[PDB]
Design an enzyme around this catalytic site. Structure first.
Site: not given
Length: 330
Positions: A35, A199
């Site tokens: 994770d 992004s």
């Protein structure tokens, strides 16, 4: 040194991925959920409340000659999905794919919430976010990657998750045969303890790319792709019959649909998520309504590039002095 381990979907939908991890002496092998959105290595154990164990493999520290109780240390964690676990702490030897750390904090669960009990395939979590998020008290502990970093040939790990297929976590090296083209690196902020990046925009299907900054986290421990409501609405508007369902808890769509792809920007580069990766199957057994793999982050507080996004790429988690993330097509 290096390590290399195969990671395998827990079910036919890629709801999560498990990776075998050797703990203790002699080795006890547990299948852990790696994770990159948390920083605790915790396991089902001989100390876990018996009624809360249902088929998981447990770590028994009393059978490990290298286990040592970390005196006075406790841990307690709550995840973004509402699940939680807590317990005490041992140090022991932990190996992943041939890479060994001695003295790793292994957090032994005394309590787990129902969603963990109900998932017999996940024996615990191995956190790979930054050690500042580790929950051990009163002395915070380091992640497996943080403990191994200095020994690695290069201070990196890579995630190469498969679509409906196994993939690979590598530590200490970049397998140049595992991706196409080049790796595009992008800046990371560690201020929230995550692999947080921006992004450069998105496209839906064959549509034109929208240049827009989307701050979010690269999180292998989250199944879906959580993005701003505007972006998610633009995606699902291209799917006849798709709608956001308050009762189901997100966007659903007709199982008969063919989904468009979704592209996200990494600098000037582009990662394309095929439409099929966004299908999470019937909302309940036998239903013709299917759950979407792109969902709104509006109720989260952060955008999450989970497995839906990451499995479309070869992803480098670069733990150099200034961390960065790399993405390549594959």
């Amino acid at each position: 040194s290096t390590g290399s381990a195969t990671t395998t979907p827990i079910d036919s939908l890629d709801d999560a991925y498990i990776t075998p991890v050797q703990i203790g002496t002699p080795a006890q092998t547990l299948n852990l959920d790696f994770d990159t959105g948390s920083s605790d290595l915790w396991v089902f154990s001989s100390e876990t409340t018996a009624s809360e164990v249902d088929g998981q493999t447990i770590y028994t520290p009393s059978k490990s000659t290298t286990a040592k109780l970390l005196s006075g240390a406790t841990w307690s964690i709550s995840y973004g999905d509402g699940s939680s676990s807590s317990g005490d702490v041992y140090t022991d030897t932990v190996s992943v794919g041939g890479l060994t750390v001695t003295g790793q904090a292994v957090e032994s669960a005394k309590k787990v919430s129902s969603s963990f009990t109900e998932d017999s395939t996940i024996d615990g979590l191995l956190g790979l976010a930054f050690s500042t998020l580790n929950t051990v008290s009163p002395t915070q502990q380091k992640t497996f990657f943080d403990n191994a970093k200095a020994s690695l040939d290069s201070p990196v790990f890579t995630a190469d998750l498969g679509y409906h297929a196994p993939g690979t976590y590598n530590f200490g090296f970049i397998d140049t045969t595992a991706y196409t083209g080049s790796i595009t690196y992008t800046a990371v902020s560690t201020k929230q303890g995550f692999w947080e990046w921006t992004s450069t925009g998105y496209a839906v299907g064959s549509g034109t790319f929208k240049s827009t900054s989307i701050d979010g986290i690269a999180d292998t421990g989250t199944t879906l792709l959580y993005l701003p409501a505007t972006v998610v609405s633009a995606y699902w508007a291209q799917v006849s019959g798709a709608k956001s369902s308050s009762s189901v808890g997100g966007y659903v769509f007709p199982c008969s649909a063919t989904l468009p792809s979704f592209t996200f920007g990494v600098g000037s580069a582009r990662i394309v998520i095929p439409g099929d990766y966004i299908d999470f199957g019937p909302i309940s057994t036998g239903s013709s309504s299917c759950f979407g793999g792109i969902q709104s982050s509006a109720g989260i507080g952060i955008n999450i590039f989970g497995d839906v996004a990451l499995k479309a790429a070869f992803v480098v988690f670069n733990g150099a002095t200034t961390p960065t993330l790399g993405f390549a097509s594959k």
